[PDB]
Swiss-Prot record, chain B:
GO MF annotations in UniProt: DNA binding
InterPro entries: Hus1/Mec3
Protein name: DNA damage checkpoint control protein MEC3
Domain of life the protein comes from: Eukaryota
Localisation: Nucleus
Source organism of the structure: Saccharomyces cerevisiae (strain ATCC 204508 / S288c)
Primary role: Component of the checkpoint clamp complex involved in the surveillance mechanism that allows the DNA repair pathways to act to restore the integrity of the DNA prior to DNA synthesis or separation of the replicated chromosomes. Associates with sites of DNA damage and modulates the MEC1 signaling pathway and the activation of RAD53 in response to DNA damage at phase G1. The complex also physically regulates DNA polymerase zeta-dependent mutagenesis by controlling the access of polymerase zeta to damaged DNA.
A cellular-component GO term for this protein: checkpoint clamp complex
Keyword Cell cycle: yes
Amino acid sequence: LANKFSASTVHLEHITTALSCLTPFGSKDDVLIFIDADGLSFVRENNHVIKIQLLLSRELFMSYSYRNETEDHMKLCVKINHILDSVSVMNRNSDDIVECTLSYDGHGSPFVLIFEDSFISERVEYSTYLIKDFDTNGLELDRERISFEAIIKGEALHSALKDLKEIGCKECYVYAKTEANDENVFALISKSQLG
Amino acid sequence: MKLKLIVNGCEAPDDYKLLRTTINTVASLRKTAILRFNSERLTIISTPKSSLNSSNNGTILRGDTGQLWCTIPHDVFRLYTVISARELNTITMECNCDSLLSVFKRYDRVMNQGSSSNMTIKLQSMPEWNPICALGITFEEIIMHSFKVPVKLLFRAQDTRIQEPMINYIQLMMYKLPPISGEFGSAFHGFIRRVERYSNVNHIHLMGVKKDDVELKIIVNELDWHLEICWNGPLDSVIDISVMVEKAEQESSSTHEVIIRCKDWKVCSKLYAAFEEVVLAISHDESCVFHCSLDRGSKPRERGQIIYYIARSKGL
């Protein structure tokens, strides 16, 4: 395509999964989209205290073209509510959608999303906004001063988070300790109405 | 003023379906409908310029400008006795749509039950009450069910003021819609009704662009995000204080666009679902015409026609 960025895929699960993951950061706020040859990233921040970055690499798309030359990456800002409503209305017939294409033509142009079916194509253009002065890179891990590291199975952590949510947890404490004989202790301690 | 008509649904079901669709459309469009019984065909009109309809002031209050015209050849009725001393033995009347719709619904129920009787329609002078007469309708039910409907006859002067809208054919782009019974019929039916998924959308922008050699798009700009719905399947093109409306200059010689109301589009979708041969005509920034044609042959017979004219809801 003639656009500066154009990526098309046949797996609609990735997009809806990304929106689902971004939802907990607020149904009505801004989302930053970073585009580069490596891939496309969604970034959200809350209260200057928490940040989420979800990456979609080239491999996830059956076609991926990034023709920009002046800049190695492109930054834009959109409203999450617009995308959420548009996708919810367009994704009602999820069984029939066969292709999804994202496109962008640089600063001053909208972010274009096209759902292509067998005979019907729906094209939506999202207006873009100036990016806030706050830098997403500000909140980052100091790779040279790690206090501790741990690897956990997704299912167990998700179950623990569910349990904490169901008891109305108000404060959380991550406790990590190591001893000899390969003894390890990782725990989550919750302060809630239960105590 | 003898208007003896016999209607049978077991013979030529296409004509009965056409009549049912016509009455349903006129009932859903306006409260009252005009019936013109000529020596050759019956014309059913739903227009805001009628004496009864104009009593609602629809045009000024809600912009009810669309006009529905339906033609039924005399061959539809088993018996067609229409004798008059007017031009071409024409008799004009105005009737209420709800009563006719209820009577036809009862007839449909009786037919579905298993009866194969015929409906006799005549004009009668009711002594109970532009004199007002009654439409005596009767039919057997395997019991002689008879119902009467008020009707108001019209004069020649009143009749002549109701004239079918015409369009500038030379400045008019027509598209032959895919047949509903075809493999693409379901796809086009879904494409037409797609915009209904957005409740808050009131106006839709229809666009037609050359280069199956043309394409049709529905644009919605009432939402927080611009929306375009495109049809990529096959689609063939057929080859006082009053002032004229202002027309925006066409972007190109091969693009025709018009903005219309969503209700008119729903009516067009229903009409498209009803019939097989449908043509959509656009007069750029002027109007949209939905023409449903039913073809029957024996010496080809008369073609059943339903033409719905929709004026633009907004300027371009």
